[PDB]
Structure formats: structure tokens, C-alpha cells
Amino acid sequence: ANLWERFCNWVTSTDNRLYVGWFGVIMIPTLLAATICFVIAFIAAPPVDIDGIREPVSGSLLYGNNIITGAVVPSSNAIGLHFYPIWEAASLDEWLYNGGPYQLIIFHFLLGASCYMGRQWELSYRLGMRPWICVAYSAPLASAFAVFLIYPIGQGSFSDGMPLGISGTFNFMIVFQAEHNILMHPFHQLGVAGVFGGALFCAMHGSLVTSSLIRETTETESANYGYKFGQEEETYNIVAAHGYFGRLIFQYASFNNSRSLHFFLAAWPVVGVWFAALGISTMAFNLNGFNFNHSVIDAKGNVINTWADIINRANLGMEVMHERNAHNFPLDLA
């Protein structure tokens, strides 16, 4: 075989400790670049003028941050959605002042994670598997896209993309609530149903299978040793687990079919999170949460507050305080 043929065989080999594959051919360098730039920036990058008003925000550890406060800071509002690679800067110092690391990292990362999804398809194909694990992964991926790419596009600036840091994430959330009332948006509510529900069903399934483990061990050893990797027999009694849960609620609320059950386990959080992503991605174009501000009115016309109006007051606090030196005109239109 010729060199290219050999190379292809290696790339797509099912015997590599970590599968490479063609998606991996793109994934590996982009994820490495994103990772390296991220670590160096998080430790050592100078303050970044996120909002384009010459008010640099310090993100890195060496410049006064800890793990909780630190971040790689989004690129300058002056850049907006312009492409700002290293070679567009007059110098690395300019590049750093304007938040170049952020763009390098999120673009390399979004590409790399997309290829990660593709790679999940690819290995499933090489191993003779069914292909849809990658579809499950599309949910967290879509969310990543929502906060790093789509929301910036809609608002016209990567300065509004989610910061790469813990406190920065919280900042993104609070400003988001101010400007979109995301809590009153049904797609975010479906997202909450997705992750609360995912947690519920995770615990539920975990506990039901654990409850019906077939006795294979003594009391002085871990029950886990009762399962051996690759054994053909199922390790728990699903009829007993179903007897239990079916009696816990009523019989027809419970799954007797393991395939049906596991499909449910996949579908609930995945769909919920799909809607969370779509929530962010559509509030990106300012179609916002329900607004029931002053919706209840008495016979004279006095406003009768509901809990929605209290929410509105909180949001007002966030709105009037955020980016306190950036607005010169009365409406925050992006």
C-alpha cells in the first residue's frame, strides 16, 4: 500500500488508544490551540477592554484574580463582530488589550467541539454501532454555540458572548435576565425541566437498578464485584425494579421495557437542553420572555402588582447598573 493509503488506515484505525479519524484530524489541533491559549491567558493575560470604553477588565490569575473571579475576557465592543486574529493587531500588546485571546479560543473551540461530535458519529460507524450518541451530544454543543457565537451575532458584538470564567458566566446570566427576562421564557423553562428532570431521572434510574442488583457477593465485599465486564447476563432484575416502581406510583406509569426506558433517559434532557439552546439563540434576536408588567389593573386603573412586577423591579436594578459607563442614550438597544 502507498503512503497515503497507510496514513488513511492509521487515521481511521479502530485500534488506536484514542480514535483519531478525519474529524479528529481537525479536532486535535484546534482543541490543542484553544486549550493552550486558554491556559496561558487565564494565568497571565493583561486586562481587556471588554466594552470598548477604555475600561480594561482584569481576568487572569497573575493580575489579581482567583479561580472563581478569573476569566478570559470577551473581545472589545469596538471590534463588534469583526474578525480579529493575531495578525490583524499591530502587536501582541494591542491584541491582548483588545481581547484577541477570547476570539482565538472560542473559534478554535467551537470548530473542535463540532468535530468532536462528528468524531462520535465516526467511531460509532467504525465499531458497528448505531449512530445517535452524537445527536445527544448536539444538545450541549448547541448550547455552547448559543452563548459563544449566536448571541454575539444577534447582539452585534463578541463583547456580549459568554466570558470564559466562573464569575464572568454569572455576569452573562444576570445581564441576560435584565435584557431578555429569560426566566419568563418558556424555552428556558423547558431547559430547566430538562436538567432538573435529567437529574431526577438520573437518580431514579441509578437507585432502581442499584435496588435490584442480584445477590452475587458477601457483606464484606463491594456489590460491584458481583458484575463482571462483558458478562452476557444482565446484572439486575428489571422485573423486580418495575414491580417496585409500578407499585410506587401505579403500574402503567412505569417502564417494563429497558430500551424504551433508556430512550426516555436520553430524550428528556436532550430535548429540554435543545430548547434551552434555542432559547438563548432566539433571545439572541430579542424575542424575549413573557412580559406581564402591569398586566393586572383594578376598576379605577390602579396597577395591582403581581410577582411578575417584582421580577421586573429586580431586572430594573440589573439593567440600570450593568456596564455603568457604557451607555450615553436612554435605551439599551443592544
Binding site: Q251, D298, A299, K300, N302, I304
Partner: protein, 81 residues
């Protein structure tokens, strides 16, 4: 099974619908009238649209005393003349 009649049987039986084509509308109408007669307001002490404020008042009738709270609410209601 656990001895009860299948729901499929029941809800597709003629007798079930002879019973419930009466009992369901009756209940629905009862609740409807509970609202339309105004009884709900008085059972639960909920303000009608013209009973949140007296005409020139703009202060919420907030309960501020634990043990004479009842009397406070009664006073607040009298204050609507």
C-alpha cells in the same frame, strides 16, 4: 392486573357516558356559578376590582400586627366605606 375494571372498558361504555354527560357538566356549571354569583370573593376574602383601594387611597392595606391582624383586615375593609 389488580382486580379493578380496565379504564378502556369504562370510558368507552355507554353507561359511563350516561352518568358523566350529566355529572361533568353539572360540576363545571357549579364552579362557573361559584364565580359568576360572586360567592368565591366572599368565601376567600379576595378583593373585587373595585375593592383593592378606597377612591383616593394609594396605600396597600398591609397587615402589620400579628395578633390583631384579623381586626386590622376588618378595619381595612370598613375603610372602603
Amino acid at each position: 392486573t389488580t382486580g379493578e375494571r380496565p379504564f378502556s372498558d369504562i370510558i368507552t361504555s355507554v353507561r359511563y357516558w350516561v352518568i358523566h354527560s350529566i355529572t361533568i357538566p353539572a360540576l363545571f356549571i357549579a364552579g362557573w356559578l361559584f364565580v359568576s354569583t360572586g360567592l368565591a370573593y366572599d368565601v376567600f376574602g379576595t378583593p373585587r376590582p373595585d375593592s383593592y383601594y378606597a377612591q383616593e387611597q394609594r396605600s396597600i392595606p398591609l397587615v402589620t400586627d400579628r395578633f390583631e391582624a384579623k381586626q386590622q383586615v376588618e378595619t381595612f375593609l370598613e375603610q372602603l366605606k
